Assembly symmetry: D2
Homo-oligomer: 253 residues x 4
Amino acid sequence: ANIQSFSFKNFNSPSFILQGDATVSSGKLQLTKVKENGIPTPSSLGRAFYSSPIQIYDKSTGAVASWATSFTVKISAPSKASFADGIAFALVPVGSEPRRNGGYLGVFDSDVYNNSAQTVAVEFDTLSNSGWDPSMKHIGIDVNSIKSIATVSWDLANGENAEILITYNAATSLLVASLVHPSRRTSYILSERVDITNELPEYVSVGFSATTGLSEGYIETHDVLSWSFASKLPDDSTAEPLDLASYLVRNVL
Amino acid sequence: ANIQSFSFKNFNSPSFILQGDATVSSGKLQLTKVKENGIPTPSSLGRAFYSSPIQIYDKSTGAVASWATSFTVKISAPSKASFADGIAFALVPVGSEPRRNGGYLGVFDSDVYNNSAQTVAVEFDTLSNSGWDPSMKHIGIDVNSIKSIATVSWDLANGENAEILITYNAATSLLVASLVHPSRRTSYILSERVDITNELPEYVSVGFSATTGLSEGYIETHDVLSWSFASKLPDDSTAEPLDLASYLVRNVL
Amino acid sequence: ANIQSFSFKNFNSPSFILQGDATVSSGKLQLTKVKENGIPTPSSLGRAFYSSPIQIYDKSTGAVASWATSFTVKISAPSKASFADGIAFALVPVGSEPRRNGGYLGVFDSDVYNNSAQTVAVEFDTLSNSGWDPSMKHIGIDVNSIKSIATVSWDLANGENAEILITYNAATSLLVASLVHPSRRTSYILSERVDITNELPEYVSVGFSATTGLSEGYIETHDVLSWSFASKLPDDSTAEPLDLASYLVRNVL
Amino acid sequence: ANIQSFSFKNFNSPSFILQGDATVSSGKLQLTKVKENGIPTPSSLGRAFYSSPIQIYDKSTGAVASWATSFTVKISAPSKASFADGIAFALVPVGSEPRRNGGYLGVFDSDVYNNSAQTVAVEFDTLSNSGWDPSMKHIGIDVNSIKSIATVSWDLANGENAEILITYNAATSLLVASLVHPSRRTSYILSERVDITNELPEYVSVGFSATTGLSEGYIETHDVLSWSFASKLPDDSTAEPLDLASYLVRNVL
Ligand SMILES: CC(=O)N[C@@H]1[C@@H](O)[C@@H](O)[C@@H](CO)O[C@@H]1O
Ligand SMILES: CC(=O)N[C@@H]1[C@@H](O)[C@@H](O)[C@@H](CO)O[C@@H]1O
Ligand SMILES: CC(=O)N[C@@H]1[C@@H](O)[C@@H](O)[C@@H](CO)O[C@@H]1O
Ligand SMILES: CC(=O)N[C@@H]1[C@@H](O)[C@@H](O)[C@@H](CO)O[C@@H]1O
Ligand SMILES: [Ca+2]
Ligand SMILES: [Ca+2]
Ligand SMILES: [Ca+2]
Ligand SMILES: [Ca+2]
Ligand SMILES: [Mn+2]
Ligand SMILES: [Mn+2]
Ligand SMILES: [Mn+2]
Ligand SMILES: [Mn+2]
């Protein structure tokens, strides 16, 4: 079995691939632009990936990897400003470049399924786009399109911390994402099946992608305060779910 | 820091402390009685704990441990029979003996708060007891009483597997439990704050407790198919949440 | 696969089974008797084991476990006193009681092979017993007898810390033990093949055993400052050596 | 604390940075050139590093990382051919390019200390270079020069597997390397103190470097069969040695 993992509480470093307005300051990962006084900026776009590619599966052996990630984000909107556009955890092709800004979170080009996009993302959408979004602020699983295949309402606590944990169990082909606002003792969960070998390439780059609104009053910040990732690729077809018990304590908590 | 952990996929062994009708057969952990033909039996009660005590916190240093567990249960009810009574993951005092059967799951004596019980449990209640239960089948956090301080409805898929993951983050004093029925792609989550140092002793025994109905038609089986546990106790007051990423992959998946 | 592991940097607790004069004080594990002023005492004997049994192999499946341990010991002898008798890391039968004191380290009864003793130990002998010991202080692998099947000279740095790491790789049936005196920058290693399934039972208790000399001038202390242990038992015959890289960093360093 | 780690038993992938004649074939890492019939080739040079940089320490906080690695190499020399030149595990500056071939293993330029080389390597020298080498084949710790600051004789078992484990404990500033030839039951160890913050930059690239002889009869192969790595960087000056117990079992064994 092949294993790769990491856990960063502090951010300074070449261990990441930054694109767009993504930057590292005060040890935290700032995905979108921010003025000197600290207020967010419109029409922004930033992405950030681990410098080492991860193997999601192996065509030759039939092995599919089980992985898991957890990170803490802090989304803040200025006093009287509205939220937009959101942040997404994504698995993209290795050389990949940003895509459509605004409501496309910098990861997709359309709301129609396009297998060739080879991108899967878990989004935390803070602005409802009438063309494809549900009426509320939600969490959703996007498979090669900006139109999620499953969503759940989400009550975004402005400025408060968010603890996210996403996992993919190869044994059941299930992708589960959960969110918790410790401050409010509120918690959300969502799960759906995904045939990962069909949607993504053998190797992918894992990281984040965020965007702000295209207008003056639709802005917010996207700070990643910490990030953990673990992936395990077996040798035979026989998949083996990960050990989240040992993972969270050895990594998150 | 002190760390203890384990992960069992197969069950034969002296590594566990069995009480009541709990037994190990075919490598799986059977908490309640079952006839030879396999049908469950009424008025049953079984408990099972890891033979090694775990330190939840240290009074001298002010350190509080962050821990996490995950296990797969399979609850089945005979053809025309009703469900009852349920299974619970519990943290009990080291020498502890079973308690009230039936709707008390063998862990509590009353539905009134009694700090001296020194027991905290996450229950998966399959029968609503009019005296203290919500109208549905639920998941709940019980703190020194059989009356949960928080619950969530749960649609028990008869005979299908259930994947549970419970975590306690000392940093936020938050207890979160989630359940997933892979077969149905359904998932539940529940979170509440718990002041662990006040409800439990410094050392506890971790394991399961289950019971069947007191009548002929209220029966079900309680099979634990696998179990993982990880606990981390720091040296100073400064708590440190676990790494669930590395935990799940190194333990569950 | 089944996995058990732990790592203690502080010692207070019921997580251990103490025998003889073994005691826990100031958070360190003191295997032998010490008067109040701190000087060691003659004819002493103490043992200490993890309260949870470990499965070394499974007769039914043919699986043999690969394990590893690391601990820091501090052996001190009073001013003008000689060293004796030594400390040993041992794998003994679950219910086992101490054995011969003095030069038998409390784990063996004779210097003749006796398969029924079902005991394997890595010893750090500080006194040469003319009947079976080499001329100098050594490290040795004892298999069902006090007469090691392999040894290596060892220059015991009085009062200085000793970092020991022992591993058993089921794939090559090799037992390797190494010692390092950071203070002097000295290091020792020893390796030999052991057919574990033939020398020990399916379940064993892991821990330490130490003894002091039977005379007034042959004394020393045996303090364990920290201890880590990890064991992995596969499902099929196919053995899988452990990951010492991830083990040491997540446990020792 | 920041943590990075990986464990590869199979080699196909972009996760590595190959230089020179390094190549990946049949899933194993071949550091030097080999003709089609499989025989080694003279004047060869290949290097290979993990695509993600690792932080050895942080100037701002005073934190120094404790790390550990383990890998299995197979060195083979054609029938009547002599051995040369050797393989080395190295920590080099991020953008670094190969250096002198032959007896310089592709990592150093001279046998005189040159702090500006910013390179530390553990070498497994298979040919004694009269200018700076000891008389026999050895294992050595090289700090900014090809002239080791410490060495140990080594009996290279031709064609047999070699299991290497290297660790650096920030707490004691000690670098320890050990080698084991399972086939012969032989084992070697070497330890010395290294002030890592003074010899290397904050960020380095970890991997291997190997070379063959410059003549027709001084050739051998350099196959890496597996590789594990784990690094942990604390937040304050207070260093914390890794857990090799949990590392080896979760990674090597
Ligand atoms: C498709 C698209 O980018 N739509 C954007 C939307 O995402 C949001 O940024 C909004 C702010 O006023 O501006 C547009 O409507
Ligand atoms: C308090 C109590 O044990 N109540 C039980 C309930 O838990 C359930 O077992 C039922 C079955 O008919 O019998 C009783 O009502
Ligand atoms: C066989 C045996 O226990 N021999 C002991 C030896 O181990 C040592 O303790 C010595 C101290 O004077 O006393 C005896 O000779
Ligand atoms: C300094 C240097 O590279 N010396 C090399 C030596 O390392 C070895 O490769 C030999 C083979 O014949 O050729 C030269 O002497
Ligand atoms: Ca949107
Ligand atoms: Ca009930
Ligand atoms: Ca002796
Ligand atoms: Ca040389
Ligand atoms: Mn959406
Ligand atoms: Mn209830
Ligand atoms: Mn001896
Ligand atoms: Mn050399």
